[PDB]
Amino acid sequence: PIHQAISPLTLNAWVKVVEEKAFSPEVIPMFSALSEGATPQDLNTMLNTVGGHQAAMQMLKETINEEAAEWDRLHMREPRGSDIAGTTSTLQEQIGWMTHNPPIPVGEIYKRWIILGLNKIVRMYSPTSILDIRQGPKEPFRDYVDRFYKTLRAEQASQEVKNWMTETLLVQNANPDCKTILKALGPGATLEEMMTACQGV
Amino acid sequence: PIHQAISPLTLNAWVKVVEEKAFSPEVIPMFSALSEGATPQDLNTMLNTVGGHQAAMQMLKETINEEAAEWDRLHMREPRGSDIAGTTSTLQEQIGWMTHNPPIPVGEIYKRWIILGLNKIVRMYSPTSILDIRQGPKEPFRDYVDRFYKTLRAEQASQEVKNWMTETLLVQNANPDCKTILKALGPGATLEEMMTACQGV
Amino acid sequence: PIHQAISPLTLNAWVKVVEEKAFSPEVIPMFSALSEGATPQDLNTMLNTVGGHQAAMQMLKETINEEAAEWDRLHMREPRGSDIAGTTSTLQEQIGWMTHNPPIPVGEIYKRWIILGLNKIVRMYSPTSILDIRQGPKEPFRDYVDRFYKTLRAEQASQEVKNWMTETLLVQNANPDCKTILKALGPGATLEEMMTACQGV
Amino acid sequence: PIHQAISPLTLNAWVKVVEEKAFSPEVIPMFSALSEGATPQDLNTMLNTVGGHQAAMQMLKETINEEAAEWDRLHMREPRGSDIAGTTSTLQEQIGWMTHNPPIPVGEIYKRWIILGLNKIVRMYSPTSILDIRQGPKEPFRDYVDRFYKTLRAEQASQEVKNWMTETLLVQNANPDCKTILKALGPGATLEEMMTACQGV
Amino acid sequence: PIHQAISPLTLNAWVKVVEEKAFSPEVIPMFSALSEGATPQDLNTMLNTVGGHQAAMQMLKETINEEAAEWDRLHMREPRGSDIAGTTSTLQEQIGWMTHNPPIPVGEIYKRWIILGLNKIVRMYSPTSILDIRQGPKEPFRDYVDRFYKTLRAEQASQEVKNWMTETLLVQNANPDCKTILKALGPGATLEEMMTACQGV
Amino acid sequence: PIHQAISPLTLNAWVKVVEEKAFSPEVIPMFSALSEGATPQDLNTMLNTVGGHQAAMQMLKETINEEAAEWDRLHMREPRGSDIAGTTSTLQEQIGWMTHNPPIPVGEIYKRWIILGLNKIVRMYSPTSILDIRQGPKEPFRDYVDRFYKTLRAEQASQEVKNWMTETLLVQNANPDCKTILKALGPGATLEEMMTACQGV
């Protein structure tokens, strides 16, 4: 990235993460950490290298096409949608644009589109919905909380709904004894206080 | 590549990929990502190192000979076919040509020929044809789509035929229940909509 | 860190340590050794990458919110709490602040907050309390001391209480024979003297 | 090589290749790719490090002696055979010669001699001769071609004989059905055409 | 060390050595080879990272306290004991002292103290004393010598006592036949002569 | 070496080779390839790190003492034996001597002494003598030659004796059939000719 060719120690890491972690919600920060300040011709190389999950990678290409069309409708030379995707642009043109004054972050825009696509694909790949997660009969409370939040991390929503869900839904799905202990704890109890009060059981 | 010798951490990676991934359609982007801005005398070293699959590597040499003959018929000194292949050229001559003003991308041309050869060899190595891929009796729809597109990726064709194949052939090979659900969904349904509507079954 | 992107050889190491060592008390120095002189936008990348233990990572985010609120109440432009956390700041603004004269160590402050959060989370994750650790019937004294101190390392307290605990509590929980040998050794005996006197048994 | 000492990441790779791949015909390009622009005092270090196969490495030393004697008979100071082999020369003398104007490629000459020796040793290590390779009763044609060419790669001969062997001998050793299909295909059929016509069986 | 942060490829190596080799007498040279010209704030990071063996690492801290107290009693600004240990000093102060003219080797002093502590801890961790090592009934003489010297390496003593022990004690503990052969060899026999004379048995 | 500290990627390689390869005759070139242009204070670090084989490493120290005494008897300031060994010299003095004009290769001398010691130790560690190596009843001739030369490599002797041994002793120990075939081949037969004539059996 920003010129020098992308090192094989990065492509192998990206391929290995996608192969092993599947599309768990932690793939998105890994993608944004591996490719920093990269031209679109590097994200394309980073995306085509993924061996399996071609059906879920075409869906990411559909999303790229939609965003490119929206930018093209909205709008050196003018950067159009097919130029942001890096499929109708030369390496010299992109590097000159990224080093121009003022610079146009074509790579940054493509990275943002990929992040949107990855958010949507991971959202679909979530196994089950939050309302289906229920506390087990004999299960440590730390395990239950660390499963509930892992499920909630995949879904994305506005802070008002999520804040309501974390505060109230969590205490609703507990077993009778844990529900009584949470109720006895009372309102305004932070997560640490809830877990440390109910850690004995 | 562009002068410095190619690092062993790249030859080992290229050999290991070809040995393990065989000629799955993801080998082509890996080849184009490992060797960037490389002289033809580096692609030759990257090709001879492949241990097995010598029959499919001679076919890549036949394709190189055909393309070299076509360029020689079409046409410092003049770059002929035997000079593009790097077998009748000196390292000093190639480096001088690649640093000359204007530069002649002899390495780029050889890389393009190898990409054409790799496309043809992978096309032959595809196990079965698209029309043979049929949905199973009890099989998740995501699995079926991610097998159908993996098979379709190997074949290369014009966008008009492929667009027709992806839109219509996919809905033709489904089982009666999935075919009914797809038909009830109606025209203009994108891939994400099809999969999310039929994900319940 | 301090500009250049964080190498993947560091993110993989941090993820692997947290995955394997869990939250044993040695994670805190590992975290402070991996990220030196790093902008807050690097600690965020280092924290989001952790796959599991999301419940214990949200608690670290609650602690970050509390510390950010306290700083905001206490107080280029003024660095507020949401700016220290790196969620409402640009990379250019942070780098300029960290290279400004005089420099404001926003990254250092965030690192200190994370260290406080990590201390609290590890303190909670300690399996059992010191008073529950008792010497076994037939157990080497070195093993007993190296289990007692490992348990005591997780708990953090003022030096006066800890000095009292190490000097007196250690000799209180021994078996009758080891208690007699420690008493025969007498006051002012350092740890090495205690272990080398009682190493025979 | 060209001054800096040879990195251990190269000696380990060379030792591991020779240990694992034995003397398969792909060792020669690996040797020519690992040591580029290297002084003779580096090839000697790269040759002595090989643990096993000392009998086949002495034969490479016999070949070096023969070539050195021929050069000595044929012919700063004059580079003689014992000087090309690097056993009677100082590092300063070799580096000065390799940086002199005009430079004498003593390292290149030694590398060429080693390549000749390696060609001869691999030729001897070939398991069986081409005429012994016969198509099996029930064997895929791709497997047969990829075994026939692997055997033919070890033997080295003039292009006229090899071209005759590849065109005619290949179609002679086939089974009756494959021989009939090849004959029905007719003259001028390239390797790809032969394999794709007979791939069905 | 001497400014740049310590690479993770060194902390992992140090942790892995201490975890695997335990406190065998070869840990001391490994510690002195990993950290060269390092500030005290790097040795502290290298010491806290050790996961297990906390009891034997507190003893190393007791030794550090003793040496720091002795230096403080013995004695920019004056470097006191709590300043040598790096717990009451800033990174800027230490770097300035280590780059000052004349430079004060605070890091070197801390390294020497750690070496003294490591010598003492390894001395305690030695399994058995030299006088307990006896030659077996049917045991190769090379094995016996290579066990005797490994035990003697852990103990540290003045050269006069050790020279007496190596010359005389070694020949005292042999079996009757080996004792007769050693006696027949006579005085002034070096170790190589003893082993090569008695290697037949 | 020549100033910068020795990388841990070299110490680990040296320790791993000595641990695995034991003292096979290929350890000597590995030692001379790992440490090039190194000060004596680096060879000492490279020697002390070896975990096992302390008996055979003390013998290398005895040899160092003998060579140091001989140099001291034979003879900035004068480099004496205890100064060549690096045990009574400062790093500044050695670096200044190695960068002085004219430079004194104290490191080179120590390296040569270690090579002499390693030759002697490997010579002792050879399992059996050449005269004990006999051809088996049913054994491939290549295997026999590659065992005979491996044994002969450990022993070091003048070229006149070794040339006599390779030419005549090799043909003396063969079985009757191979002895007849070698005799029928006649005088002046090189190793390759002998092996290729007798390779059929």
Residue numbers in the entry:
A (entry chain A), B (entry chain A), C (entry chain A), D (entry chain A), E (entry chain A), F (entry chain A): 1 to 2, 12 to 84, 96 to 221
Question: What does the paper behind this entry write?
Answer:
The HIV-1 capsid is a fullerene cone made up of hexamers and pentamers of the CA protein. Here, we show that these Arg18 mutant CLPs contain a non-canonical pentamer conformation and distinct lattice characteristics that do not follow the fullerene geometry of retroviral capsids.
We initially analyzed R18L CLPs, which were assembled by incubating the mutant HIV-1 CA protein in 1 M NaCl. CryoEM maps centered on the R18L hexamer and pentamer were refined to nominal resolutions of 3.7 Å and 4.4 Å, respectively. A comparison with published structures indicates that the R18L CA hexamer is very similar to the WT CA hexamer found within native capsids and in vitro assembled fullerene cones. Lacking the IP6 binding site, Arg18 mutants are insensitive to assembly induction by IP6 but readily assemble in 1 M NaCl. Subsequently, it was found that the R18L mutation induces CA assembly into predominantly spherical particles (as opposed to a broader mixture of shapes), which indicate even more efficient pentamer incorporation than R18A. As in the fullerene cone, the R18L hexamers and pentamers are connected to each other by the CTD, which forms dimeric interactions via helix 9 and trimeric interactions via helix 10.
